[PDB]
Amino acid sequence: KQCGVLEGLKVKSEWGRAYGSGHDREAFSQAIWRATFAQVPESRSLFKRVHGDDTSHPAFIAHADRVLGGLDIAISTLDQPATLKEELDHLQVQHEGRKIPDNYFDAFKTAILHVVAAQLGRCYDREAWDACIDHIEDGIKGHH
Amino acid sequence: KKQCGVLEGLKVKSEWGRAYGSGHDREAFSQAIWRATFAQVPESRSLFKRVHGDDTSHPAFIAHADRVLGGLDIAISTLDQPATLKEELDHLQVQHEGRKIPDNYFDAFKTAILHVVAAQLGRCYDREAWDACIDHIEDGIKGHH
Amino acid sequence: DCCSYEDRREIRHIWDDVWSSSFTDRRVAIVRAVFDDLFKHYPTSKALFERVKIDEPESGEFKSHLVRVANGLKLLINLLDDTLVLQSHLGHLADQHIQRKGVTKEYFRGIGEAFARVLPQVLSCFNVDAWNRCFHRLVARIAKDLP
Amino acid sequence: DCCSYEDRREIRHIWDDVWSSSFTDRRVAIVRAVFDDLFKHYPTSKALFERVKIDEPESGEFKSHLVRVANGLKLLINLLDDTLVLQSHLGHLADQHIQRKGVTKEYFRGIGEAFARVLPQVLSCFNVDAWNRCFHRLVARIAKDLP
Amino acid sequence: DCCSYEDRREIRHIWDDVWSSSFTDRRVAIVRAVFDDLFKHYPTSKALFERVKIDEPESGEFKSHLVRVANGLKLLINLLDDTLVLQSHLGHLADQHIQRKGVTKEYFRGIGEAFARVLPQVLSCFNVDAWNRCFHRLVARIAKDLP
Amino acid sequence: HEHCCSEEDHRIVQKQWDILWRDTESSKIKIGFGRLLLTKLAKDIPEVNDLFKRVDIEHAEGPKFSAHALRILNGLDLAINLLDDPPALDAALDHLAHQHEVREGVQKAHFKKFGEILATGLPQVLDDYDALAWKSCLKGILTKISSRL
Amino acid sequence: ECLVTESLKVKLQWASAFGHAHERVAFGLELWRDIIDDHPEIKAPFSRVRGDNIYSPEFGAHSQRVLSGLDITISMLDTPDMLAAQLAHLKVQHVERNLKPEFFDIFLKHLLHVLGDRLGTHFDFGAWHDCVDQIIDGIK
Amino acid sequence: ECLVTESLKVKLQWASAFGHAHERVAFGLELWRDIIDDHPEIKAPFSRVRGDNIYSPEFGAHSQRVLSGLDITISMLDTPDMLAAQLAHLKVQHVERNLKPEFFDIFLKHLLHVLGDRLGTHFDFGAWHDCVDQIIDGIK
Amino acid sequence: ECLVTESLKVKLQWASAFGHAHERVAFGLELWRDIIDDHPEIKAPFSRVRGDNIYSPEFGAHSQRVLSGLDITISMLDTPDMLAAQLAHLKVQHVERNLKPEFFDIFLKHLLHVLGDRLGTHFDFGAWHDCVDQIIDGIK
Amino acid sequence: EHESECRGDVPECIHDLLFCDGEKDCRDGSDEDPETCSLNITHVGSSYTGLATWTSCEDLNPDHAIVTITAAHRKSFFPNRVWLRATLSYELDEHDHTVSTTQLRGFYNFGKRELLLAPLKGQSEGYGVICDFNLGDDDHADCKIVVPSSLFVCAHFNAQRY
Amino acid sequence: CDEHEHQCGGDDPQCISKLFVCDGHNDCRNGEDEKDCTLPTKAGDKFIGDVCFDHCTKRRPEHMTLAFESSSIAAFFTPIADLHVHIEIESETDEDESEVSMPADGEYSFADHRLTIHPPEEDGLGLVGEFDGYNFDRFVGHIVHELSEEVCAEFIFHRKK
Numbered sequence A: 001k002q003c004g005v006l007e008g009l010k011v012k013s014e015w016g017r018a019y020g021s022g023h024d025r026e027a028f029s030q031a032i033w034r035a036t037f038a039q040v041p042e043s044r045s046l047f048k049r050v051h052g053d054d055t056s057h058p059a060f061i062a063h064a065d066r067v068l069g070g071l072d073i074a075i076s077t078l079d080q081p082a083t084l085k086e087e088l089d090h091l092q093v094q095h096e097g098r099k100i101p102d103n104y105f106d107a108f109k110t111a112i113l114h115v116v117a118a119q120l121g122r123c124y125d126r127e128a129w130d131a132c133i134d135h136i137e138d139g140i141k142g143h144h
Numbered sequence B: 001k002k003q004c005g006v007l008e009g010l011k012v013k014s015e016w017g018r019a020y021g022s023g024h025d026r027e028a029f030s031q032a033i034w035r036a037t038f039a040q041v042p043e044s045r046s047l048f049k050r051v052h053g054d055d056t057s058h059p060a061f062i063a064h065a066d067r068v069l070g071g072l073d074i075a076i077s078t079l080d081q082p083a084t085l086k087e088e089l090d091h092l093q094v095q096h097e098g099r100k101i102p103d104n105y106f107d108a109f110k111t112a113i114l115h116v117v118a119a120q121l122g123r124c125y126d127r128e129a130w131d132a133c134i135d136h137i138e139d140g141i142k143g144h145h
Numbered sequence C, D, E: 001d002c003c004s005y006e007d008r009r010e011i012r013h014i015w016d017d018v019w020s021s022s023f024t025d026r027r028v029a030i031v032r033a034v035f036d037d038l039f040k041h042y043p044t045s046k047a048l049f050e051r052v053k054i055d056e057p058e059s060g061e062f063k064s065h066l067v068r069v070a071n072g073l074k075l076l077i078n079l080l081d082d083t084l085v086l087q088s089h090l091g092h093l094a095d096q097h098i099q100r101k102g103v104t105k106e107y108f109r110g111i112g113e114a115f116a117r118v119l120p121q122v123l124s125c126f127n128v129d130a131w132n133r134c135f136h137r138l139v140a141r142i143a144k145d146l147p
Numbered sequence F: 001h002e003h004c005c006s007e008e009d010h011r012i013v014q015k016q017w018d019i020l021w022r023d024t025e026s027s028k029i030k031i032g033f034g035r036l037l038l039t040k041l042a043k044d045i046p047e048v049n050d051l052f053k054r055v056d057i058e059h060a061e062g063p064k065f066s067a068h069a070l071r072i073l074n075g076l077d078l079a080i081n082l083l084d085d086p087p088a089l090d091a092a093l094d095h096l097a098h099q100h101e102v103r104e105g106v107q108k109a110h111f112k113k114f115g116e117i118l119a120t121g122l123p124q125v126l127d128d129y130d131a132l133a134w135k136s137c138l139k140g141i142l143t144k145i146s147s148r149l
Numbered sequence G, H, I: 001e002c003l004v005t006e007s008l009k010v011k012l013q014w015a016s017a018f019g020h021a022h023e024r025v026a027f028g029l030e031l032w033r034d035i036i037d038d039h040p041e042i043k044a045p046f047s048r049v050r051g052d053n054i055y056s057p058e059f060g061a062h063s064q065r066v067l068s069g070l071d072i073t074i075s076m077l078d079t080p081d082m083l084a085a086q087l088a089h090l091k092v093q094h095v096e097r098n099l100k101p102e103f104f105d106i107f108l109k110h111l112l113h114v115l116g117d118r119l120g121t122h123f124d125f126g127a128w129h130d131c132v133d134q135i136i137d138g139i140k
Numbered sequence J: 001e002h003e004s005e006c007r008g009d010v011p012e013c014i015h016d017l018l019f020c021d022g023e024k025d026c027r028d029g030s031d032e033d034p035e036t037c038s039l040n041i042t043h044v045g046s047s048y049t050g051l052a053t054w055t056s057c058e059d060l061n062p063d064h065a066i067v068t069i070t071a072a073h074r075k076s077f078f079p080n081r082v083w084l085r086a087t088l089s090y091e092l093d094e095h096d097h098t099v100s101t102t103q104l105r106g107f108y109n110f111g112k113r114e115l116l117l118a119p120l121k122g123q124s125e126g127y128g129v130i131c132d133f134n135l136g137d138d139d140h141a142d143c144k145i146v147v148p149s150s151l152f153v154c155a156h157f158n159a160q161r162y
Numbered sequence K: 001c002d003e004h005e006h007q008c009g010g011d012d013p014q015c016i017s018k019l020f021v022c023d024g025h026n027d028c029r030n031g032e033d034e035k036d037c038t039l040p041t042k043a044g045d046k047f048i049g050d051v052c053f054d055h056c057t058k059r060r061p062e063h064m065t066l067a068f069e070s071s072s073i074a075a076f077f078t079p080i081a082d083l084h085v086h087i088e089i090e091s092e093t094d095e096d097e098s099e100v101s102m103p104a105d106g107e108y109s110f111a112d113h114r115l116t117i118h119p120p121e122e123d124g125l126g127l128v129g130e131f132d133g134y135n136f137d138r139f140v141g142h143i144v145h146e147l148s149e150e151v152c153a154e155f156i157f158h159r160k161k
């Protein structure tokens, strides 16, 4: 149920195998979002500034890499509880300036799980992953 | 035929090495000989009632056949030393002596090995060479010329 | 009970997942959690290892202990494709444990479980049965001549 | 008459059947039967080889003769894929036969038959024509400068 | 403007057609025609190279000049698959041209054309665009300061 | 259900065990390699010397004994080449035990040595091998022999 | 002159050329075989490990314990504090035996030799040769 | 005794074993590494090219300029007249530096060494060894 | 200490590494090239076979006659009686030429060298090194 | 090698002396079915053909070459193999259309599906022939004339039947 | 294709990443990646294999059976559709007439047509189904050590009718 400092590095290893090199990454991004929007149709309104109407437009592709790019930093360091809280706290002020219900990034949680499972080599522990990214979710929300 | 022809003695010694091989094909190479023999002499199966020789694919019998080749390997292995052969061979006499083997049967078991070897082997061998050597061994186990 | 063969290939992959790095950050944190799991069931052993300043969990020294345990343990595994060089290096590693006092034959059979209770939480695909079988024949050959 | 090429590959297999072993039991018995077949047609030659105690068929010495004949003969064959090293080693092996008395040019052309006489009886598949052609150009280059 | 990569493979084949030989008959006649085409547009440069007896087209010496130009030029190309060894050898080849009088930063940019006007007659398939682009970044760096 | 002597191991054994017989003839090999195994036994346990009187062990190079040395390795050989397809092997070895049964004065503790000779004897005569593998299989052959004693 | 970047490179190249498993033993024994052909006296101290014949086992065992040591060293070579600790414990093992201070300086010469053939032309000698000194001096 | 037929053969075998591209640099650096292990003093004059560490670049650059020279030499080795001209210009470059006349005679010994492994048993030593002398003497 | 078993092993390993045909000559010439680089004086006695240049033919011929000898020796190495006979005849060939008793002891050192690379880590040094002595002493 | 996969749904790998035996040694007993025992290929008088390229000997330039089966026997007690005799014939190109005619004997193996022959003895220009019928039908082939010792590939001809 | 990419081209090859087959909308410009979203294996379907060769020896069975409790589709994102499967094995030996039916849960992937079974016991034997893509009465699927990715034992399954 907690980050379980051993289990913390479990996902740290798995994530490396899933989030890969090459242009598949750009494809690995598309999956997550195409999954998310199908759960919450009206969440696209929040992206009017990034051309989030259609998801295949080049301006949007850029947006999604930064998202993974950002999330890579998070999972990269669960070893140092200091630097995480520093780096993570940065993301708070990013989202804080607009209205994100606690319903959405519960669904974006469900989205990453499924996509990872497919992309990954048939073996991973859900309840291990479930905890760690949820710790990050408690982070950006700003309060637990 | 030739009296073992001490040169020709080692001819078969080499060929036999190429035929009798490594791996599980040996277990298969055994099955051939017997399946061949019994088809020539239907009533010879009676002698094997002790080894479960009714059916030939039963595991207890497979063991029996390897010892037979295993035994015969020793024979053909040494035709160089006329002493040790007569020693090793003489052992086989007392093995078979305790039961009734007509001179008809192991004449047929002679015919059996020939055919099987030819197939198993690489298209080239001299029959009249082989014919002599194993027949020398046959004169051995029979106990008398 | 018979290390066999396939079990060793099973190991060589399992061990390659935990050991893969040129940094020591990971190899440390894993093995430290082995003993940290050990001492919870045999606090008496903790009275030993006083030479290395055990009392400090994060010492500038204590790491330099566990690090040599790994590189010693990893040294075993990379011999399994070549035996007969194991025995020699096995017998050596045995004698280094008899020259001190407080090493009980009961402690080894304990850590055999210690990996099994907490070795996987690091990996995903893991064979408990394999790792547990070929590990005894390592450890049961250390405690032979020792009390 | 033209050793050619294919004939040499023909040899290299034929020779590999007779020579295959690390023991000398076989290589001896074959070459001994060569001369044993030779002396039957040229008993005069038997008056030579007195240095080696020929009169004892099974001597502790005589074997140590035939053994060096083989290893010398086998030394020829393993050069046929590389010529120009043959001539040198051919000319050498020639001169070692002119330093003595009683070696007739007629004797070599005899043993050419001696293998053809009885070398088949050891093997099964055998090419008489090939072995006979490429063997002369070996021997007819030993008797060149010799009476 | 960006040697890129594919352009280099383009070169490596082009250069392999002109350079292929162990004799110098061809490599000479080609490079001699480069300067012979150069001097027609900059006769002032011909006043330099007096040390090598330029005045004799056919000299026993002058060839020994152009030959070292090629082997120097060919030395560049065979480094393009391995950079960082170019710079070092580039900077060296630069300084050997500042130790003398009469280097026209202007003349380097001249010979850039000289090949482009005397290459397409030795070969058949030729890429003008490629050879012209990756050649400047060679010459533009051997005329880095001045001269 | 046996874990011991798993399938993958004896494949290694048969491959390594076959490196000896790559050479032709080979009769002289396993005569000699067999002649050592019995003598080197007598110099540890002297008691067994009496058992071989019928074959005249007193002559090491003696023909009458030499022919016995073949049939022990050859009998061992068919055991190894038959390791695969287990249900046959059980019957194969069963017939050896009974063969040692009618012979009297054969003590179970002898084999325990004969293994230790061979287990440390073998590593001299081979190029490479995994001692762990051979250890498993030879416990199979030896332990099942003597089960009649 | 060893610091930060020029150290980091030694780690990556240590991973590759050092290999794994049966390939590792073959690496170690290929090292010592260099130096013993060069400096014949060096086999005097190894009478404990039967360094009579290096190809024999039990030395094979030894030489692997050796290289394993460099792993511990080179692996922690980033964090300066904890480095000295192993270097401290290491020297202790070498106090009680007869050495010369010149054999050490010899060792690094013939080690960086063997890495040459496997890495061909690719590596920083400067990075190695200086940063193996920071390992070697701690033993004196 | 050289320059004709026996010269021609050196050209053909120079083509093969000398290789090309990345394979060429790897050839040169494999040469010097021979002689510096044999004759340690030889690295004194190279302080200009940072011959401290041969594996470092800028020496890599140098040693290739070296071999490139033999190309010019061996390439024109048929036509006797023009040969001396390069040999003349070449010596001039070596006048101003501290050498011993014995290092040259050493060089050809260790060069024909390395060609051994790549050509195995196939070549005329007599052709090389004598016809590299016609290159080496022009430098004295 | 050479016995029935520890001898047998040398035969099997002699078969493998010694190779065949064009691969055999390449083996022999790779041997001598070791020792002549180490001990330069050794080429004095070979002026008969033009041991000026080993890569030249006629020496190639020689060195193969050499190894062929070891075959005769090692092949019969099981049967002790007939062994001495060849060893007896062999020494006779070496009586009439200038040797040192130390060159022999040198030979076996550099022969077991070359077998190292082809066999890597797999063989009994003890078996070879002692059982080549039983060959070498018969020559004294 | 030295074994032949079975013919059916589920591929097994069974030793070559156990086909057309009179005992089922597979899972499904593929070895008893006339999709295998059919002798259509070695019935006496059949003949294969197709012009041969020569690589190794004679360098004759491509010209027709036939194989023919003069007499076949199958022994009642060892039905695994069909012993047979043949005559190879190929066109030497001199002036008039002429042919040298080897004469052969050998066995036909139901496992490999490949008949293989050899020269008899004291026959001019001793060759042997290896025909693999691994294609679908019992016609066509990929043969090769070989030297009888090495099984070295003398001449390769892809042969049909008329 | 390249690595994890999938080849949709009928007559004009178009190379697309694996995560977009049965994505829910048109990515392949043919339109040939959306035709296939019908799942082939329906609950109650029962497959029975026969052995090909077996070195991973738990019971080294003669032949083994496989049944579907229930397929299920995660609604929103459906390239992958998870499964419950029994695996029945009816053994026999000297002694015993033992049985087994271990439950597990795999997933069938419309991408490369493979189905997986995550190890039923702790022994770490994954079963890797592979259809050809056009048939669905038989698959050549074979067992794998989940950690090592090595082919150990094959079976040829059939649907029963």
Ligand code: HEM
Pocket (backbone or CB within 6 Å): A043, A046, A047, A049, A050, A066, A067, A070, A071, A091, A094, A100, A104, A105, A108, A136, A137, A140
């Ligand atoms: C683990 C979950 C998430 C992480 C790590 C994450 C991270 C980030 C990052 C790194 C940026 C980059 C901003 C920049 O470069 O300037 C960003 C932008 C953004 N994120 Fe997220 N995010 C997450 C979840 C969400 C969710 C669930 C939503 C909405 C439902 C959301 C909405 C946005 C928006 C609208 C922006 C762009 C704001 C702008 O362009 O002004 N994010 N996010």
Ligand code: HEM
Pocket (backbone or CB within 6 Å): B044, B047, B048, B050, B051, B067, B068, B070, B071, B072, B092, B095, B096, B101, B105, B106, B109, B137, B138, B141
């Ligand atoms: C070259 C020919 C033969 C050889 C070398 C040979 C050899 C042997 C050998 C070595 C054994 C093993 C005995 C043991 O381990 O207890 C044996 C057993 C046996 N042989 Fe033969 N044999 C040959 C021919 C025959 C023939 C033709 C028959 C009968 C037609 C026959 C009948 C038997 C029987 C019945 C046994 C088993 C007796 C028992 O179980 O007590 N043998 N033979």
Ligand code: HEM
Pocket (backbone or CB within 6 Å): C045, C048, C049, C051, C068, C069, C072, C073, C093, C096, C100, C103, C107, C108, C111
């Ligand atoms: C399970 C596998 C184990 C391995 C492979 C192992 C190996 C080693 C090695 C190589 C050292 C360093 C020796 C040296 O530097 O020469 C060491 C140190 C030590 N080990 Fe272990 N060890 C193991 C388990 C244990 C256990 C379970 C205990 C006690 C319960 C123990 C007690 C010690 C102690 C006390 C030292 C410190 C030696 C000192 O005081 O200097 N080890 N071990």
Ligand code: HEM
Pocket (backbone or CB within 6 Å): D045, D048, D049, D051, D068, D069, D072, D073, D093, D096, D100, D103, D107, D108, D111
């Ligand atoms: C056919 C191929 C032959 C080969 C390759 C061959 C080769 C050799 C060799 C290598 C030796 C030993 C020389 C040495 O130790 O330095 C030898 C010895 C001898 N050969 Fe031959 N030989 C052949 C045939 C013959 C024949 C046909 C005769 C006589 C009819 C003959 C007469 C001798 C004699 C007398 C010696 C003994 C030299 C001595 O007394 O020490 N050889 N041969």
Ligand code: HEM
Pocket (backbone or CB within 6 Å): E045, E048, E049, E051, E068, E069, E072, E073, E093, E096, E100, E103, E104, E107, E108, E111, E139
């Ligand atoms: C385009 C590529 C060029 C390359 C790669 C090149 C390279 C070389 C090289 C390697 C040498 C011999 C240097 C030595 O022996 O140390 C040389 C000589 C020379 N080069 Fe160039 N060169 C080039 C173009 C030019 C041009 C365009 C000029 C003048 C317009 C020039 C003028 C000279 C002169 C005068 C010498 C003779 C040096 C002396 O007097 O001793 N080069 N060049």
Ligand code: HEM
Pocket (backbone or CB within 6 Å): B091, F048, F051, F052, F054, F055, F071, F072, F075, F076, F096, F099, F103, F110, F111, F114, F142
């Ligand atoms: C390890 C594998 C062994 C095998 C495969 C084996 C095999 C054989 C066989 C087959 C025989 C009977 C020969 C025949 O029936 O003609 C035999 C005889 C005998 N074996 Fe063994 N044996 C083994 C080990 C031993 C050991 C360890 C001993 C004693 C310590 C032993 C003592 C004997 C004796 C005394 C005989 C009596 C032979 C006679 O009466 O002439 N065997 N062995």
Ligand code: HEM
Pocket (backbone or CB within 6 Å): G042, G045, G046, G048, G049, G065, G066, G069, G070, G090, G093, G097, G103, G104, G107
């Ligand atoms: C270059 C880095 C070196 C490291 C990291 C190193 C490390 C070690 C280690 C870990 C041990 C064994 C401790 C144990 O088994 O518990 C040891 C023993 C030994 N080292 Fe080294 N060593 C190095 C260099 C050398 C060199 C150059 C020599 C030269 C002869 C040498 C000679 C020995 C000897 C003779 C022993 C045996 C001590 C014994 O068995 O009593 N070492 N070394």
Ligand code: HEM
Pocket (backbone or CB within 6 Å): H042, H045, H046, H048, H049, H065, H066, H069, H070, H090, H093, H097, H103, H104, H107
């Ligand atoms: C065997 C034929 C040799 C040839 C063809 C040759 C050729 C050359 C060439 C072309 C250069 C450079 C000229 C330039 O960069 O413009 C040079 C420089 C040099 N050579 Fe050689 N060389 C040979 C032998 C030697 C030998 C045996 C030594 C021994 C140490 C040596 C030492 C040097 C040194 C130190 C330099 C550097 C000069 C500097 O940096 O100013 N060379 N050589």
Ligand code: HEM
Pocket (backbone or CB within 6 Å): D096, I042, I045, I046, I048, I049, I065, I066, I069, I070, I090, I093, I094, I097, I103, I104, I107
């Ligand atoms: C190690 C085992 C050795 C064996 C088995 C051996 C054997 C032989 C043989 C067979 C010959 C030629 C006899 C002939 O052609 O008829 C020979 C010649 C020669 N051996 Fe050795 N030899 C050995 C060691 C040595 C060594 C260490 C040297 C050192 C220099 C040496 C120097 C020579 C020389 C110079 C000749 C030439 C005789 C000549 O050409 O006239 N040998 N040896």
